[PDB]
């Protein structure tokens, strides 16, 4: 997308829409301590079932 | 016996991986709080990059 | 639990705030027809702010 749009030139729609997916990177550290936080409820639910 | 040996070093596994979970891994028992009571910064989580 | 949460969060959204400001004053008077500057406008949204 970054290169079409680059090559035909103009605002490019897809860009615009999602723009903040492109200019943001994602950041792992606010979830990992919750995943495994979370892990023992996990398993024990997924055991119930 | 042979289940409780291989039980072992699971536990041992999974101790080893949440030491290194979050937020910065560290001795985050009592180092985040520890962190913020005094007007300071984790000095791993200054060199996280 | 809580506070600290909150902490982090605040701090990742600070530190994406000054980035951009930073890579949006290398675009500044930049010459289009009659565009004159171009900026990245970051804001937070009030039912998250609360």
Known sequence: ?49 | VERDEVAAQKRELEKQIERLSQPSGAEDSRMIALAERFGGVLLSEIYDD | SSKSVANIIRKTIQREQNRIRMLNQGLQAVSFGQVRGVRLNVNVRESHAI
């Open chain 1, 1 to 49: 997308r970054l290169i079409e749009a680059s090559l035909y030139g103009g605002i490019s729609s897809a860009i615009t829409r999602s723009l903040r997916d492109y200019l943001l990177p994602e950041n792992s550290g606010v979830r990992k301590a919750f995943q495994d936080m979370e892990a023992a409820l996990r398993e024990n639910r997924i055991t119930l079932e």
